[PDB]
Amino acid sequence: QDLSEALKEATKEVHIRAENSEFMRNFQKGQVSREGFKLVMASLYHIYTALEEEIERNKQNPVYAPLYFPEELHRRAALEQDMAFWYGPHWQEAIPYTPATQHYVKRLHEVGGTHPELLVAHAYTRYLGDLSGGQVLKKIAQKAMALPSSGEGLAFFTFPSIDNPTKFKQLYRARMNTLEMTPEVKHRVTEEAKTAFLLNIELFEELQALLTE
Ligand code: HEM
């Protein structure tokens, strides 16, 4: 069974759970506040920062390299733009770094530094979601918060170097499927993708609590 399939199958249950966190339920109904949107976007800033640091560290390592698509996919620069938009020119000292965000970053570093053959799980879990359901989430955010079609404040959701997310996502899958795979690696990769999903659920749980306090 192809890795791209193994991953989709292994994470379909947890994805349903992630969509139904209180925060994402509220987000999907169009109930997202500037305050809640800023918190999640600032948390993604840190998460993608760490993910992309580890991607760069491992760019030439054959357990990751077929997935090295910085120009098309990387989000740090977009998130920086969004932080300037939502937090102002001194955003770097204004943005929060929550404990659940710290926890996700810590695991990212563990993987990139000690278990790089698992880094595909983490890239799959964030980027493939961004290219599919993230585009739906984009449209809800825009409508909720009166964000302009010109894209300010939603740079994260915009892929100016990908013409067509569906076709790119098929390419990314195809390339995933060229990674050297043994039963060992495959089984652990799909386990780590479940953990990546859980780290996201735990973030959403935390942000909801911070918003309700
Ligand atoms: C309300 C929240 C969410 C909505 C409405 C949503 C919606 C979607 C939709 C419509 C797809 C396409 C499904 C398909 O093509 O069969 C998708 C795929 C994906 N989503 Fe999300 N999603 C949400 C949250 C998340 C979260 C929190 C994560 C991970 C952090 C995530 C990760 C992914 C991944 C990795 C895929 C690709 C599945 C694959 O094709 O292998 N999603 N989601």
Domain locations in the chain as residue ranges: 1-213
Query: Residue for token digits 């910085």?
Result: 70
Nearest to 189 by CA among 112, 128, 120: 120
Nearest to 46 by CA among 96, 9, 5, 113: 96
Nearest to 82 by CA among 45, 135, 33: 45
Separation of alpha carbons 192 and 179, rounded Å = 16
d(CA 79, ligand 1 centre) in Å: 20
Ligand 1 atom nearest the C-alpha of 28 is 1
Query: Residue for token digits 């060992």?
Result: 184
- Ligand 1 mutation target, pool 128, 132, 177, most atoms within 8 A of CB: 132
- R_g of the chain, CA atoms, integer Å: 17
Residue partners of 187: CB distance under 8 A and separation at least 6: none
d(CA 182, ligand 1 centre) in Å: 26
How many of the other CB atoms lie within 10 Å of CB of 98? 17
Structure tokens, 31:
């109930």
Q: What is the 3-state secondary structure (H, E, C) of the chain?
A: CCHHHHHHHHHHHHHHHHHCCHHHHHHHCCCCCHHHHHHHHHHHHHHHHHHHHHHHHCCCCCCCHHHCCHHHHCCHHHHHHHHHHHHCCCHHHHCCCCHHHHHHHHHHHHHHHHCHHHHHHHHHHHHHHHCCHHHHHHHHHHHHHCCCCCCCCCHHHCCCCCCCHHHHHHHHHHHHCCCCCCHHHHHHHHHHHHHHHHHHHHHHHHHHHHHHC
* Residues in the ligand 1 pocket, defined by CB under 6 Å: 7-8, 15, 18-19, 24, 27-28, 124-125, 128-129, 132-133, 136, 197, 200
Nearest to 128 by CA among 36, 193, 78, 187: 193
Experimentally, the structure was elucidated by: X-ray
Residue partners of 76: CB distance under 8 A and separation at least 6: 45, 48, 49, 52
Nearest to 167 by CA among 196, 131, 192: 131
d(CA 91, ligand 1 centre) in Å: 29
Separation of alpha carbons 60 and 182, rounded Å = 20
Q: What is the CATH number of domain 1-213?
A: 1.20.910.10
Separation of alpha carbons 203 and 101, rounded Å = 6
